[PDB]
Amino acid sequence: QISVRGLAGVENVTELKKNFNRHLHFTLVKDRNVATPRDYYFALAHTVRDHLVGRWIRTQQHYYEKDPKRIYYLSLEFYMGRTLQNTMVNLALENACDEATYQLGLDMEELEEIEEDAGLGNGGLGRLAACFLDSMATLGLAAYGYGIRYEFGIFNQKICGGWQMEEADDWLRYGNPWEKARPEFTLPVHFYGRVEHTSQGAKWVDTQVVLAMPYDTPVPGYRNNVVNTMRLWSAKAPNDFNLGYIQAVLDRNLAENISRVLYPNDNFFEGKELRLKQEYFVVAATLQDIIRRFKSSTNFDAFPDKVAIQLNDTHPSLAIPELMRVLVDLERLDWDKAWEVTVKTCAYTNHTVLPEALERWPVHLLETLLPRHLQIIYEINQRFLNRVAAAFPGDVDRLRRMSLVEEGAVKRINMAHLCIAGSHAVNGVARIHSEILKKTIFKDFYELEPHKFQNKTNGITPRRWLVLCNPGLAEIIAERIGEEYISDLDQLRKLLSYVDDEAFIRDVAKVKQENKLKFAAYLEREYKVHINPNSLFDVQVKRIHEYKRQLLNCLHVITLYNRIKKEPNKFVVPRTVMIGGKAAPGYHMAKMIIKLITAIGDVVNHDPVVGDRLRVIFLENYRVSLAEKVIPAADLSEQISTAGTEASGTGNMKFMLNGALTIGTMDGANVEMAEEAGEENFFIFGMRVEDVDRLDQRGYNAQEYYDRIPELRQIIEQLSSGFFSPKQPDLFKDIVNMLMHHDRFKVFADYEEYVKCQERVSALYKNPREWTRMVIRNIATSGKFSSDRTIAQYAREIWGVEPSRQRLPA
Amino acid sequence: QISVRGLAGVENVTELKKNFNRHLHFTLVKDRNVATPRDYYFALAHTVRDHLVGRWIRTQQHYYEKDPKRIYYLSLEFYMGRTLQNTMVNLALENACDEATYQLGLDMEELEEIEEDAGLGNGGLGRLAACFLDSMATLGLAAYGYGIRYEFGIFNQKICGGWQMEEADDWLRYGNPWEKARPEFTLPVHFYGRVEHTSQGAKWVDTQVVLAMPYDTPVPGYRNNVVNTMRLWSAKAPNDFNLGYIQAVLDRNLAENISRVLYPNDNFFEGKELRLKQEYFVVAATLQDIIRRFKSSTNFDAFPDKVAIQLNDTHPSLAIPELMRVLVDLERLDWDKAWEVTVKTCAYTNHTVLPEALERWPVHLLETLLPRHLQIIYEINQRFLNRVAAAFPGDVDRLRRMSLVEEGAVKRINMAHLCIAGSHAVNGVARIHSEILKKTIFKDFYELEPHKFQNKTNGITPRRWLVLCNPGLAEIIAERIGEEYISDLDQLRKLLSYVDDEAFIRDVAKVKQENKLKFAAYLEREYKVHINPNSLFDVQVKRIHEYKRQLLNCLHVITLYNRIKKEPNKFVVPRTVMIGGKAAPGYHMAKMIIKLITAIGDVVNHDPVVGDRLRVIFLENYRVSLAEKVIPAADLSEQISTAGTEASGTGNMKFMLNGALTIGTMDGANVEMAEEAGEENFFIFGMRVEDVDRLDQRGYNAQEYYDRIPELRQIIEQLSSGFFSPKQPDLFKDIVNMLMHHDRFKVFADYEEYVKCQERVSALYKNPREWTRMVIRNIATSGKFSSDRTIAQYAREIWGVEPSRQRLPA
Ligand SMILES: O=C(NC(=O)c1ccc2ccccc2c1)N[C@@H]1O[C@H](CO)[C@@H](O)[C@H](O)[C@H]1O
Ligand SMILES: O=C(NC(=O)c1ccc2ccccc2c1)N[C@@H]1O[C@H](CO)[C@@H](O)[C@H](O)[C@H]1O
Ligand SMILES: O=C(NC(=O)c1ccc2ccccc2c1)N[C@@H]1O[C@H](CO)[C@@H](O)[C@H](O)[C@H]1O
Ligand SMILES: O=C(NC(=O)c1ccc2ccccc2c1)N[C@@H]1O[C@H](CO)[C@@H](O)[C@H](O)[C@H]1O
Ligand SMILES: O=c1[nH]cnc2c1ncn2[C@@H]1O[C@H](COP(=O)(O)O)[C@@H](O)[C@H]1O
Ligand SMILES: O=c1[nH]cnc2c1ncn2[C@@H]1O[C@H](COP(=O)(O)O)[C@@H](O)[C@H]1O
Ligand SMILES: *Cc1c(COP(=O)(O)O)cnc(C)c1O
Ligand SMILES: *Cc1c(COP(=O)(O)O)cnc(C)c1O
């Protein structure tokens, strides 16, 4: 049908059809007469999966032969989404499979909807790991993703009476065709025990053993025949575990609980023992694999030349003392040499400056669970603080500020300080964020070792986030500039010469309209809600956090409603305001915000005077597969975090690539986005970081804004009096109290500028031609935000390896 | 190589080789360079598995079209063993696969040793279900086996310091290629709750729900292209289960524990709640399947014409009140009509007369877990006792004896009485056992309803228990009488005309010698123990129970040892005495017996004066795959239970088919075996049932035997004084105390006759020609003990269906 989806040759189509029928019969044990749509999905999945095998075996044997430097990306989260369409895209099989299934009397898009998301992450950090794997494979790097195979990923969100309910994400129920179990490569992981000091150094003894069983998932590069591996560990009890009899067998669950469920708290660090076990589990098993592979090529001098370990946040920070443990205790290397190797091997990426999110493990937990690692941490700390004292003699306060050990009621280990000490590179994820790191929370470390600190601005893969989710846009772009931009997104700059092209303007606007029509139909079919497809699609999708300020969006929505009620017969640009995202289960305020959004919707959507001029919809169960649907349909992207709080954002980039304009603060990657597109092509508002700082020094008084802005006062009165909850008039008292007395994120301070900026958005939307021209200027300058660019910078500036777009033989 | 293993045609061999290579590549994702023997096993397994698919689909669709009466065999145990060789045998693929693998440079027998046993049973009852499935498929019956997919089967037995240790049987660790998960056919099972009485009858409400997910395993008939299904249920938590958040997800384990582990207690009934849950779980899920299939053909009059349910012991006895529940509560049938349907549908098989093994569930457990079923049981009981009162007016003691409710400190439900009341047929498993049922424990029920009581003497499948495990014997038999005996074992009678045939005598003896050589080599390679292959292989393998009297065997062994020590320079027939079997983990005496056997071995095997004239070996981890090795190697089969205690035995039949002579009491199927072969061709000794009865009336005094038999006294003195345990002289005091003061099984009473009979065995073994001639007379008359005969009797006399050896189209 469309060019970017590849060739549908007679020979390929015939072959796909017969392999489909073979799998239906031999693999699924069904015949056409009782087969369901799910059976058909699995037959297709197995058929496409077959095409990965040869490339996967030969990629991995190629690495064994050529022995390049290996990149190990350690993460507790890999937010992969669906795999079927992505595999077809990267293998150039999409049109062929579409034709093959059409000829068998099936709709491939319907079959694609059956696949469960691999929801093994919370949001941005987990999705970044997924985009990175795609880019590393596309750039021909010998890269491995290592994590945990959670039996249950991020919870499915149900909305009941306006409240979030959580249910288990049983994503493995029907099986996972994309994983290959490797029980033969099972490895032991140790917990508890005690440290014994012999003549020949320390020994960790009397441990409890949990087995780590790997499951391998292929990661195909874009049309380069490279297939890398994501290896995820599953927890298994040893066979003599607890070995009255029946209870001992049932107690195996205790060991296997390690890989049972993803922790869904993305707001606040909680020192839970099970989480600590997960963190060590992934680290201990992974490092054995790394070392095995390094030995199968005595001398650890060459270790950093052959191995890079990237830590996705501090979550796998135990890699640093674990590497030291193995090198010192098992390999008998001297401390200083082991430390040199460790530092040159490890690099650390930070994802937030919010103090409550930083990992600070109680010493008493580490003492019980990992006694040897605590000893090693103490020794790392002593040697590090000796270096600080020599560099800054007499600066006693610096010593306590930089210590890996935090003093207080409970002693804690600062995992971020551990990561900086033990890594040769530390990076933030957007230019402003990396600057904030050097000026604020890690200032002392930057002064000691300035060379360690880098920036690596985030990116997204243009495969999933353009070609897969928005084929209509990919095609109209390809018609003008060819197909090379898919693996070289900078080429989108060529589209600037089409900003005055009448055909292209019309095509861009047509693709958006079709996407909006498709999404409007999806909302009725799956959720029974009606929307006007001619309205401006105003979208804020991301996890629910106070710093992300969904509340500020709520205030604007109520303002528009109140303005309509005040002057009903005046014209306003119709809007469909869509807010979606999950709240961490223990985050009370976030759960209240969800309830507020639905409550606003209940009043607004049923007011006859409003009509179809304003609609407020909460998008339930926001996840990767839903993002692929809503983002192509969006007109306006809400990126409205308080300046200095959102480290980067990546959703922002997805919307820019897909033809939405952005209303945003100068925060995270928004700054660089506006810089690329031009500030005149961006809807920028609000305090800058400097203005926030000035307000903090003076003290933030919300009452001032309430007193001086009548429209804001009205909203607060409505909230307080029970206008949005007639049967429970005090329902939103917590929200009001927070806004008035303890708002860390200064919602009121940005309100006026936000409302004014929103008026400028509505004004431009009235001029479809000028709206679309500005859209073209955004799409054309989105190239920097490809994760291919990001990964190439990691490769060259941190890992010390060269990327290549060169094909492996098919 | 050998004829009975089928053809190895050029076309088949070429096809098997390429499909093997395809699976290695596409299914296992390996290449020849890093593939291990386990990978090669799985490639072969998948290759053979492919050949089952077409036949499986067409057998099941054939049943849907022809709508025959369906047989449902309900069991908590299916002791299947390995599947690969059995599948090859039944499909006539063995020689072809042997050649195919040979040409790829592999040894198929080595690959076969990699497969784990499916150890989903304890012993005879579980293995009977497995033999029955094979025979039902071979006789073309529309039969389904329904049970539980235990994650852990019967424990692996390790011997440490002479003691049994149990470890988890993690049989699913590497995957199971023989099962097909059917998550789409998941069904709900209800527990707890309460009973509500409305105008429209009773309702069971406020229940907890556990999901039952089926896994299907193919059961191929012998070369008839029939492939039946064994459906095993796995427990799954519903997605809103317990739905702080983390704990709720981890608590899903509580629901899923239902199918976690097989209960290994085969001696003593224990009223454990988890076991009750298992029993209802299998029954509730199975009955929904039965009813669904019956409806997919309103009128339940025809239900018994289309459905037979066979209860393997009382373990699935809840089927009776569950069927009543569904018919009365859900389908709205009147009680009397539902009861008529239930009785005509169900039949019950008893496997023991020992009172401690009978299921007697505390009322308080049923009240909490299954409140509606308890109400139904009470109602069944009232109506049943009304019938008894009308038949035997004024007989008040009969009423309390026959009641399903047992009075006492704790009220209990007698599940056996429930089964008799609710079944149209009740059978024992050997003629003497069925007679004992009618004369003793079920006498009252027999007097009320004599027509219900039947005999169905047990059998074993000649596929697994001759062709598979003893191909050498199968071949020499086939050379003389052809191949038809494999599915018509009565044809073995033709071998009587070869009893004086010199060539055949030599061939029978040669096959035995080769089997003994092969097993002697196995013992050295896998267990590092040396044996004389020229000695008489004296074998007792079965679960360790007091009634089975492994202790009597022990007494004989010590007698031979003491006789040798008394007259060292006298000639005795050399013996290798092999005892093997698992003890239930909580059965203290059985664990002591194992320790005694190893302790005897420790003294006997290291006495220089003994030499290689006597060896005592405990066969560790006795299971189906080990039985297939040891049984073909045996010369003497020990079947020495106290008369009236072993309901049938089936091991006895396996040994008879494989060319061993039997030393046994007139117990269980031994009686019929001796009747078939002729008493002159059997080594019969000891008390008959009548003699045991006479001894009980008088009172059994063990002291009498101790006082009057000097050789017995010596052994007891040796045991008491610490001759077999020098460092713990009182180790065996429990054994001695039991033998002297509370032996339910009269070990001393059979001692003299047993020892004398053993002398007659040794005498015959000195004459190899006459030994072998008697062996031929045994093999020739073993035909009755085919499970094909057993199943044909069930079919005709209980289920009301005709068997057929007719092929389905390939
Ligand atoms: O589709 C599957 N088919 C079988 O296991 C299968 C196929 C044919 C069979 C023929 C005879 C007997 C068993 C069979 C099982 N298995 C599924 O494979 C998935 C992807 O590898 C895996 O995730 C599932 O756990 C498994 O059920
Ligand atoms: O998603 C993020 N964090 C999490 O999901 C997360 C996960 C586990 C946590 C555990 C304890 C405390 C905070 C946690 C946050 N961070 C986001 O990372 C993106 C990728 O760099 C970035 O664009 C966002 O600005 C950042 O908030
Ligand atoms: O052998 C298996 N292979 C795969 O799952 C497989 C094969 C090829 C693949 C290619 C690319 C990505 C994943 C793949 C998985 N799976 C096993 O199938 C068994 C039998 O059906 C089942 O019991 C095991 O659970 C499963 O690991
Ligand atoms: O194996 C048997 N029983 C068990 O394994 C078993 C299983 C679970 C139990 C639970 C509670 C009490 C006893 C149990 C026995 N019985 C044997 O059945 C054979 C087949 O009919 C028969 O040949 C044997 O004589 C009988 O002991
Ligand atoms: O010992 C070896 N001999 C030959 N090939 C090997 C060996 N070790 C690893 N390989 C190849 O490297 C691939 C990946 O190995 P892994 O990354 O260590 O798991 C395998 O699939 C093999 O093709
Ligand atoms: O609804 C039906 N239409 C056609 N075939 C069916 C239908 N129901 C069952 N079958 C056939 O019967 C087989 C076994 O079904 P089951 O025993 O009910 O699980 C299936 O594999 C089908 O081939
Ligand atoms: C991209 C993405 C995110 C990250 O969005 P931000 O707006 O950067 O927080 C979160 N969830 C999903 C499902 C995503 O795809
Ligand atoms: C046949 C068999 C049994 C039954 O043996 P009996 O001697 O009849 O108790 C027990 N276990 C296994 C593994 C068997 O094969």
Side-chain angles (χ1 to χ4, degrees), chain A residues 4 466-467 470-486 489 491-495 498 504 507-508 511 656-659 776 779-780 782:
Chain A
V4 288
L466 179 55
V467 179
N470 204 350
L473 180 60
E475 186 62 5
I476 65 167
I477 292 164
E479 285 170 2
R480 313 304 196 287
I481 66 167
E483 275 185 25
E484 271 199 314
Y485 74 90
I486 299 167
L489 208 61
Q491 288 198 35
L492 289 185
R493 285 208 163 261
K494 294 175 192 176
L495 295 175
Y498 293 91
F504 192 63
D507 281 347
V508 170
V511 164
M656 188 190 191
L657 190 54
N658 278 281
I776 292 156
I779 298 169
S782 68

Side-chain angles (χ1 to χ4, degrees), chain B residues 167-452:
Chain B
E167 67 171 49
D169 170 42
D170 194 11
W171 75 292
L172 296 167
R173 180 171 64 244
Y174 295 99
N176 176 14
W178 312 109
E179 69 185 5
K180 179 65 185 76
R182 296 296 196 195
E184 67 272 23
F185 302 128
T186 297
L187 296 169
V189 178
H190 298 262
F191 293 100
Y192 305 103
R194 56 183 176 85
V195 180
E196 220 164 61
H197 295 270
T198 66
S199 306
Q200 311 292 339
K203 301 234 319 298
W204 186 20
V205 301
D206 298 356
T207 51
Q208 283 167 40
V209 176
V210 180
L211 298 174
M213 178 181 291
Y215 285 74
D216 290 353
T217 295
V219 181
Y222 181 73
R223 296 171 197 193
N224 62 353
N225 299 322
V226 171
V227 180
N228 286 339
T229 298
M230 175 184 64
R231 175 159 284 179
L232 306 180
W233 301 103
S234 192
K236 258 267 187 178
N239 278 6
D240 56 356
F241 192 84
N242 277 29
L243 287 159
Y245 168 77
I246 295 292
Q247 199 58 57
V249 174
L250 302 177
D251 282 349
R252 290 172 61 100
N253 300 148
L254 276 44
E256 302 176 349
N257 279 348
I258 289 164
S259 57
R260 196 77 71 201
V261 62
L262 169 77
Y263 275 82
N265 60 289
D266 67 334
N267 65 303
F268 187 84
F269 170 72
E270 284 176 292
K272 294 289 179 281
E273 189 193 41
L274 192 60
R275 171 68 171 195
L276 184 54
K277 284 175 180 194
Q278 293 188 329
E279 292 181 347
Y280 184 60
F281 179 71
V282 61
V283 153
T286 302
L287 267 58
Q288 291 177 71
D289 246 14
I290 291 172
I291 286 155
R292 176 189 57 83
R293 217 175 263 120
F294 170 76
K295 289 182 168 187
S296 305
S297 290
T298 325
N299 195 229
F300 283 90
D301 295 80
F303 195 80
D305 295 318
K306 291 289 167 193
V307 181
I309 299 170
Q310 195 66 36
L311 311 170
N312 198 17
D313 215 307
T314 61
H315 314 149
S317 64
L318 286 169
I320 292 158
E322 175 65 13
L323 187 47
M324 284 298 282
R325 189 188 69 84
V326 177
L327 294 180
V328 171
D329 292 354
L330 308 177
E331 300 290 339
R332 311 281 193 203
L333 270 59
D334 68 273
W335 186 277
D336 295 335
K337 175 63 195 179
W339 185 245
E340 186 182 298
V341 166
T342 299
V343 173
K344 287 161 82 179
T345 300
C346 300
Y348 156 66
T349 303
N350 173 275
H351 300 269
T352 183
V353 301
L354 296 191
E356 69 268 22
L358 306 198
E359 290 197 293
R360 298 167 149 106
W361 286 107
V363 165
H364 63 85
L365 264 181
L366 291 166
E367 199 164 32
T368 310
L369 192 73
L370 302 163
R372 183 59 183 141
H373 297 85
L374 186 66
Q375 298 185 347
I376 285 161
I377 286 162
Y378 282 150
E379 189 66 38
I380 289 169
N381 192 50
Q382 182 199 282
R383 290 172 184 256
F384 182 70
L385 288 184
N386 287 169
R387 281 183 62 213
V388 175
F392 301 97
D395 197 344
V396 293
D397 201 67
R398 188 179 292 257
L399 292 176
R400 68 107 199 153
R401 290 198 312 265
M402 293 183 80
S403 176
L404 316 196
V405 183
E406 287 186 3
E407 293 299 327
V410 291
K411 292 218 298 182
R412 294 170 184 272
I413 308 298
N414 190 310
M415 305 315 272
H417 293 184
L418 173 61
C419 282
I420 294 158
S423 300
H424 75 275
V426 174
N427 76 283
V429 289
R431 185 208 293 142
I432 200 171
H433 168 60
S434 297
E435 289 303 307
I436 287 168
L437 293 179
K438 298 188 283 180
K439 293 182 201 296
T440 62
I441 60 166
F442 303 144
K443 186 174 176 283
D444 292 326
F445 298 87
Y446 173 67
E447 288 170 356
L448 188 79
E449 304 174 293
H451 58 269
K452 277 188 179 175

Side-chain angles (χ1 to χ4, degrees), chain A residues 29-31 33-34, chain B residues 56-57 60-65 70 144 146 182 185 216 231 289 292-293 296:
Chain A
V29 197
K30 297 265 182 160
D31 64 327
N33 298 334
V34 287
Chain B
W56 201 11
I57 295 173
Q60 302 305 309
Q61 76 185 15
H62 173 72
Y63 297 154
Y64 177 77
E65 294 295 320
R70 320 261 180 158
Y144 305 76
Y146 274 88
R182 296 296 196 195
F185 302 128
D216 290 353
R231 175 159 284 179
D289 246 14
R292 176 189 57 83
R293 217 175 263 120
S296 305

Side-chain angles (χ1 to χ4, degrees), chain B residues 83-117:
Chain B
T83 296
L84 177 64
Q85 197 182 355
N86 190 245
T87 305
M88 290 190 293
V89 171
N90 286 7
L91 264 37
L93 281 174
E94 205 168 9
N95 269 340
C97 291
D98 201 6
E99 183 60 32
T101 53
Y102 177 76
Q103 282 178 24
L104 295 163
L106 304 163
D107 190 352
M108 192 170 74
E109 288 190 343
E110 188 189 305
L111 300 182
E112 284 166 351
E113 289 301 315
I114 292 153
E115 180 175 6
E116 302 284 339
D117 285 53

Side-chain angles (χ1 to χ4, degrees), chain A residues 57 60-61 64 70 144 185 231 292-293, chain B residues 31 33-34:
Chain A
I57 295 173
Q60 302 305 309
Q61 76 185 15
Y64 177 77
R70 320 261 180 158
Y144 305 76
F185 302 128
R231 175 159 284 179
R292 176 189 57 83
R293 217 175 263 120
Chain B
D31 64 327
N33 298 334
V34 287

